[model samples]
Target: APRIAVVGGGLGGLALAGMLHRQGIAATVYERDAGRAARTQGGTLDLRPESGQRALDELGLTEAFRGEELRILDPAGRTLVHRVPEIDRGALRELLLSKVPDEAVSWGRRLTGVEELPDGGHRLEFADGGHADCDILVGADGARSRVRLLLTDARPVHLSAYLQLAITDADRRRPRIAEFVGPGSLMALGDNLNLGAQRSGDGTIRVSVTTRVDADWVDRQGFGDAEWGDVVARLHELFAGWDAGLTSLIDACDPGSLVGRNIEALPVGTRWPSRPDVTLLGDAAHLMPPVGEGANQAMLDGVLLARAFAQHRDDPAAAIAAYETEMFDRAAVIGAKSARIESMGLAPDAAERLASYFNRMTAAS
Candidate 1:
């Protein structure tokens, strides 16, 4: 058995670990987080039928798919895309973790350095003064990946950002916004700024306000200050004449729960020459823009990589080559598609453009 080391315990890593475990292979997942609940797993996502949903089905965890419908609205409160499925980030993570062997994941183990052995293996050094050796290494560590440096010099380029907040127990406490958003995702696109409210599986209405701005725009403003009235005032100015009810979504926010997100994507068509014993997946492989495809693509990467290994148990290099060839081309097509949508989401006629995009999809299907 090759000593398999998977760095980062996100969906990609966990998917790989679980898939491999089912094939009678054991891998260690070294996660930087102290534990599963160490940090909130963000908002609801609609797993695409081809990518994420497929990966879950292949892993024999098809029951994990929890989704509703999707809806879209225009700046003038007109409906745009009223069709899609939905799933919660936290719920999906918990489901994947449950399928994995608890001991296979070593939480709180942040990767620091990777040492290459003469036998073409890797020795992973963790920040917690621990070291582990492995015949195969997976760099599932996201965004600012520590393992990708060895493979490619490419890094994620910033595209846009989001100011996030949510309404808790909205059905009881905030009835108006509750029924406004409905059971699935409610996305309202506008000039540079987009308002998104999604019904999470956990009885919370998650909201995201996205804009094409500097990554530090939030911190540049006084959002970190004790009082957020000034920042909320800025938001009102951003959405001056939008529906008052929709504009008021900001008011229902629990300021304490307000968070900021940055949308960054790796350059499309980024591929490195195949490395024999080491490979990357997820954000480390293709950091797509925030078109709700990153996690789905990453999970698919996990499944395919696991299958490649299963097919070529005697030759790690051959498996890596096959996996990268498929992944590189697949990632390019998706990255390009996501980048196109990222621009369209912030276009001047974003609402109509997104609606038209959906129309084309419906017509094609």
Candidate 2:
């Protein structure tokens, strides 16, 4: 087997590394994080059956995942707000990491760029100027991937929106907010804004507040590291005169509880011809908003690339070319659909458009 180098140890990268190791293919994963315990943010993730679950099945972790999955399908077989399934993001990562050897992932390594060698291999450089040469380089870094820029001129555009995550310490306090989030997921969609919450095992409720604001709003309003008083006052003003439930959500956010993030995405089906020895995966390959399936598709890409290498164990160049071809064809339709979805806003016909989309999806399913 040839030496393979995987950049980034996120869900996609870890999944890819595990997939390869399971098949007796050795690969080294380079991650920028200081360690595995480096702050796991974000709420629960519900892996879609067709994509995410399917990837887990192929990777042979379906049983482990099933044990941890919070299954709650509605009686009508439709996923309702009250019966949405859930799973902890950190738990999923731990399960995948446990499958790989301790020495497989090299943390604290931040990949800077790739240098093509005349011998048909690649030299991957790190932020500190350290380098590693490999027969094939897999770029699973992420949305702001440095490797992706080598492929296309396309870049992610801001959706003119921002999201915030806050935790209500129900076990310690705020039991009412915990009860409101309930057993499943609570999704409150309002005009150009939305709030979602989910109950955590420790009795903590994960609350998210999102709003469609101009790109400059964050810098202009100076929300970064803003105090709780500032957050509450601004939140009330921004979401003023909306649903009382939403207002209560803002009110319930504890002091010193504000995590902010900007949402951006590249056009769907966005790609360029394969570079010599470098290729991208996951958000690096197709950076779309969370229309679901990003992690799943990236895992499948890992599997597909590993399989391609197996078929051409004697020819690394041919294997790389084959993987790129298959990825372009398989990801085209999904990327386009995701692009359309990211464009929808809280306009007059927003509900109608959403209803039509849901109906089509249900019918197809």
Candidate 3:
């Protein structure tokens, strides 16, 4: 029987699995994706000082990882209104993947459901006619985790927003953007649209575009059928006449490279009362926007959970119970802040408020 089973091999899952393995704990990472290089990891992530940086520091891999990374300090670290900071999503994944044991991850493992055994072990059924029995199950799956559904019937609500990301000629063709973006990431918010970009280690700049529209607006607009020129026109129209530099970057985008993601998150303070044997981490526990801290908190969750297991590995029931209790408090704090940012995106003076919050919050830490 497996002692610990982690679903999903995304950032959170990989981090958790790597940490657990480093601590001499065995965990089976089940990922639906076929392998590490299966797809582009997508978008850049800023490892915050208190959260992500702190987690990496604890794991003793920060320096080594940072050595292989390109740290972007970004023009005093403020770029919400202008410029685009980009990062290579693939490089980060490659670095993180290097830290784990070769056999730790069971790629191409797609989870279907779990059957609770009488003795407290879980029989996990795989979609591909495979199965495994595990004493502890962790759902690091993602926002739409199957493990999450088993615990709560509450469905994730769409925030009436869509996210688009693209990167082009970031190293040379878009030198101005690189200068404007400087080192760190940028967050730009207009009335109904927002953008965030970060520089990745691979010298590629990553871009994320968030826009507010009615429910099913894309489908209604027949965006699927619309030509690439139409999509570019729409982006230009939405962000029209703002900044020439920004417009050119968007306009120059190869619609073929464009990626559209519909945003969804769990309600604030989302909690699942004690299941002891089965629990969640990362977006599985609290799905929220990428408020620059999701990955950090998820690593924190991994550490906290591992600490719980280390302390209570002999008594599995108590370990999971304790982990959930602590996870709730920790997740709540971060979840609330992410939710606030989500709601305040379109508020009047939101840019100034967010900028102030970003400055003050980062400063206080």
- Indicate which candidate wins on lDDT: 1
Which 10 consecutive positions of candidate 3 have the poorest summed lDDT?
A: 67-76
lDDT of 3: 0.71
lDDT per residue as tens, model 2, 84-186? 2366788878877877677989888898877878887788888877888887788889888877766787898776465565655675676666665566555
**What TM-score does structure 2 among the candidates reach?**
0.85
Task: Point out the worst 10-residue segment of candidate 2 by lDDT.
Answer: 67-76
TM-scores of all predicted structures:
0.90, 0.85, 0.81
Name the runs in model 1 displaced over 4 angstroms. Answer: 63-71, 78-86, 352-365
Model 1, range 1-365, lDDT digits (tens) per residue?
78899998998999999898888788999999999989977666778888899989988988757446777778778776567556678889988898789988999999999998997799999999999999999999988899998799998888888878888999999888888888877878888889988887678898888888888876776666747787678788989889887789988877666777788888989999999999999999989876837889889999999999999988989999999999999998888888887888787789878767767898888
CA lDDT for candidate 2: 0.71
Per-residue lDDT of model 3, residues 27-146, tens digit only: 888899997899756555667666666666666666665622222221123345433212245766776677678898898989998888998868888989999888888889988898
Q: Candidate 2 regions off by >4 Å? A: 67-85, 167-172, 345-365
Our tally of clashes for model 1 stands at 0
Alpha-carbon RMSD to native, per candidate: 3.0, 4.9, 5.2
State the lDDT at 268 in candidate 1: 88
